Design a protein around this ligand. Structure first.
Ligand SMILES: *[C@@H]1O[C@H](CO)[C@@H](O[C@@H]2O[C@H](CO)[C@@H](O[C@@H]3O[C@H](CO[C@H]4O[C@H](CO)[C@@H](O)[C@H](O)[C@@H]4O[C@@H]4O[C@H](CO)[C@@H](O[C@@H]5O[C@H](CO[C@]6(C(=O)O)C[C@H](O)[C@@H](NC(C)=O)[C@H]([C@H](O)[C@H](O)CO)O6)[C@H](O)[C@H](O)[C@H]5O)[C@H](O)[C@H]4NC(C)=O)[C@@H](O)[C@H](O[C@H]4O[C@H](CO)[C@@H](O)[C@H](O)[C@@H]4O)[C@@H]3O)[C@H](O)[C@H]2NC(C)=O)[C@H](O)[C@H]1NC(C)=O
Ligand SMILES: *C[C@@](*)(O)[C@H](CCCNC(N)=[NH2+])NC(=O)[C@@H]1CCCN1C(=O)[C@H](N)Cc1ccccc1
Ligand code: NA
Ligand code: NA
Lengths: 31, 259
DNA sequence: GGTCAGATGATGGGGATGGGGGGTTGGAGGAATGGATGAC
């Protein structure tokens, strides 16, 4: 089972593109 | 999902839709953790109080979907179940403690742009990411409103729904409900004064509560949509199965047999 | 005078499938009754 490449989205991470509300999560991590 | 928004094509490739064969009916959500493994809430498969108790050949599993019901030709893969595994200390009598189940596919599923598994978190990722105020993301084709009561606006969405929601301190969860909480669950969603809305509703169960690590840049499944009381009610918080507190059991079944 | 039963009937009509005509994917063929009409 291909579990070494999990969590990386063919249409997002694998293309260095972000989803339209992704940063919202990252910015939550600031505190 | 209440107060959500329409998913972008393939922003949750691990989103798995659990489906009843006959009569054809969407039951729950699920997440793809492997090419051969799928993770859901126990209560989608076994809830005696509602005379619910399914079998491998009762259910289908549709992967890589966007549109809620229609067959998305050349995109979605439909897999059958080889074996259903429910946590043997899942407590359906009381408070859905350990609302977790694993589902083994007969064949592995070919990955694509639309199909790709999510990571389970390790000790550190859990410690690092599961903190009050940190936002995770829920997704599903569940209800847009409480449908058991008279309301207006549609009942179910026509494409996958997404909402991001902050984890909530255990003291708050504890007393937002009169249902006994557990260490095997966490609650999430905006507080009333935070002036923002959102929740998982009925039909969203088994759906992943995922978070994205700013270190390795990977998406991790932290929770499973478990339960709630109404949808998007003020002072009410969605409750999720705590994936990491149950990883020992997950790993124990996944790796039990040589693939 | 009003029950009854095949019966022919446009019309709105996929398909593991909506509204369309490409999409996150081809390229065609198309659901399932309705209410007027002799036989008594
Ligand atoms: C939700 O719904 C489900 C139903 O959908 C419901 O569960 C059902 O309801 C009852 C449970 O309370 C139960 O009833 C029983 O059934 C007894 C017979 O059951 C067997 O019948 C057929 C085959 O004959 C199967 O279709 C059944 O699944 C069942 O087979 C057994 O099931 C057990 C439990 O899951 C399995 O054990 C697992 O085995 C694993 C390893 O497996 C093997 C192995 O070694 O490789 C498999 C091998 O094939 C087998 N050897 C061979 C070649 O045969 C060996 C072998 O069994 C042993 O190893 C050697 O000793 O095992 C692991 O070990 C794993 O950990 C383990 O879980 C297994 O597949 C299989 N074998 C066994 C152990 O038999 C009836 O006898 C009984 O009637 C009455 O008889 C008694 C005696 O006279 C009497 O005293 C009493 O009054 C009894 O009532 C009764 O009708 C249903 O079977 C059950 N179905 C299922 C799917 O489990 C849930 O409760 C419900 N939930 C709720 C709460 O709503
Ligand atoms: C199975 C899932 O689709 C569903 C999701 C509910 C999520 N709701 C919110 N607001 N996040 N779960 C349920 O409906 C579960 C299973 C049956 C009972 N239940 C509930 O959440 C009840 N509404 C409350 C409850 C009853 C009994 C035990 C625990 C909770
Ligand atoms: Na709320
Ligand atoms: Na089409």
């Amino acid at each position: 089972s291909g579990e070494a490449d999990c969590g990386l989205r063919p249409l997002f991470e694998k293309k260095s593109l972000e989803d339209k509300t992704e940063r919202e999560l990252l910015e939550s991590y600031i505190d | 999902i209440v107060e959500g928004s329409d998913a972008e094509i393939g922003m949750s490739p691990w989103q798995v839709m659990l489906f009843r064969k006959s009569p054809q009916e969407l039951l729950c959500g699920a997440s793809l953790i492997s090419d051969r493994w799928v993770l859901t809430a126990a209560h989608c498969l076994l809830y005696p109080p509602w005379d619910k108790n399914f079998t491998e050949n009762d259910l289908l599993v549709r992967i890589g979907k966007h549109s809620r019901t229609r067959y998305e030709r050349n995109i979605e893969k439909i897999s059958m179940l080889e074996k259903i595994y429910i946590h043997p200390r899942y407590n359906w009598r009381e408070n859905l403690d350990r609302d977790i189940a694993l589902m083994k596919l007969k064949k592995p599923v070919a990955f694509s742009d639309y199909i790709h598994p999510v990571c389970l978190p390790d000790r550190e990722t859990a410690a690092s990411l599961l903190q009050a105020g940190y936002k995770g993301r829920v997704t599903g084709w569940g209800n847009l409103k409480e449908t058991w009561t008279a309301n207006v606006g549609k009942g179910q969405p026509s494409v996958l729904q997404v909402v991001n929601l902050p984890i909530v301190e255990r003291p708050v969860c504890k007393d937002s409900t009169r249902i006994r909480i557990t260490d095997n669950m966490f609650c999430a969603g905006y507080k009333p004064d935070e002036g923002k809305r959102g929740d998982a509703c009925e039909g969203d169960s088994g759906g992943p509560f995922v978070m994205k690590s700013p270190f390795n840049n990977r998406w991790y499944q932290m929770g499973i949509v478990s339960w709630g009381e109404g949808c998007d009610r003020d002072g009410k918080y969605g409750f999720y199965t705590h994936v990491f507190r149950l990883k020992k059991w997950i790993q124990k079944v996944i790796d039990q047999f040589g693939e």
